[PDB]
Amino acid sequence: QALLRILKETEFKKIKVLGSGAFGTVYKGLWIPEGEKVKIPVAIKELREATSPKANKEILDEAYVMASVDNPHVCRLLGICLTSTVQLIMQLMPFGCLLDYVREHKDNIGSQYLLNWCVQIAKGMNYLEDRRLVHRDLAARNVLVKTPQHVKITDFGLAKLLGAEEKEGGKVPIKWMALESILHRIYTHQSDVWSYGVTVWELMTFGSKPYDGIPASEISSILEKGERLPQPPICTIDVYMIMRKCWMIDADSRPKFRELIIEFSKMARDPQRYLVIQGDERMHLPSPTDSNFYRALMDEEDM
Numbered sequence: 001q002a003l004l005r006i007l008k009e010t011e012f013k014k015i016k017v018l019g020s021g022a023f024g025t026v027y028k029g030l031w032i033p034e035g036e037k038v039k040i041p042v043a044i045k046e047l048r049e050a051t052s053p054k055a056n057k058e059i060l061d062e063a064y065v066m067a068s069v070d071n072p073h074v075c076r077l078l079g080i081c082l083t084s085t086v087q088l089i090m091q092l093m094p095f096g097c098l099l100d101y102v103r104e105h106k107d108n109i110g111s112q113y114l115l116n117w118c119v120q121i122a123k124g125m126n127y128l129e130d131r132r133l134v135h136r137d138l139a140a141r142n143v144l145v146k147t148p149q150h151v152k153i154t155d156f157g158l159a160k161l162l163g164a165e166e167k168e169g170g171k172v173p174i175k176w177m178a179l180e181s182i183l184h185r186i187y188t189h190q191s192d193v194w195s196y197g198v199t200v201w202e203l204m205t206f207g208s209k210p211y212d213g214i215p216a217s218e219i220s221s222i223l224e225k226g227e228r229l230p231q232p233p234i235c236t237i238d239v240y241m242i243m244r245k246c247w248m249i250d251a252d253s254r255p256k257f258r259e260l261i262i263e264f265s266k267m268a269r270d271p272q273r274y275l276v277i278q279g280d281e282r283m284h285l286p287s288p289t290d291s292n293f294y295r296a297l298m299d300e301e302d303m
Ligand SMILES: *CCC(=O)N1CCC(Oc2cc3c(Nc4ccc(Cl)c(Cl)c4F)ncnc3cc2OC)CC1
Pocket: 018, 019, 020, 021, 026, 043, 044, 045, 077, 088, 089, 090, 091, 092, 093, 094, 095, 096, 097, 098, 099, 100, 140, 141, 142, 144, 154, 155, 156
């Protein structure tokens, strides 16, 4: 596959740490092409080492699959460096993750932005369903902001790495997983619909923590009793019904990503009807002037 470039230690450098996580540490890096004088900004993930002791042939086979995604709202793995640590290289998203963006601008986000982010995240998830790829870690933290009008889903496939009976605040995302994933470790595209519902809840609450103050070891207990995340103040009932249907105990009764795209697109064409934000009348998508300016500088891809 020509979609995964193998890099040398000597052709990239980590210059600043951006953050850590369950999979690894993220560095802003500079890619130095051979024989050139330029320095190209990249993103670098130095992964942990929980990979069930066995790989190299497995580490590369998954990277070939992670580097083959071709969708405007799914991040594509660009390179890999197999040293003492497996270092992954991708395009830099200077705006960061959607969770931190929504927290920092929680009083500057309109319903048109919120509804469009859900459509885009659903479009990105629907791609992986057709490519038969389960994310297993969909969350607002793993949604990157390319531009405020264009978000992308990242940290895919990195499931073949962690694990460990730490599912009993931790590493595995208990409060984002479906019930069958917690009890039986069943990961399907319908369990990703559950994670999508929690990710929508995170966006509508402007970055609030789900089940705040509840031990992760007790989440499966409160779910079996029927408790779910509460209705955010800005959500009409039509939007909250969608979130509740993603969290049904029967995975086959949860909506499909193809259905979530259509419904959220319908709500985006009349955003003030379905989301109630105090004064949501001044927060508008950028004009054709600014969008052309953003795309010419930061977002030249198709959509
Ligand atoms: C939501 C909070 C959070 O989880 N973090 C804070 C901001 C993040 O910093 C940035 C990360 C990236 C990434 N991450 C990434 C994901 C998967 C893989 Cl394989 C690779 Cl190589 C990655 F680099 N990707 C692209 N751009 C950014 C930009 C960031 O800040 C500007 C990290 C943790």
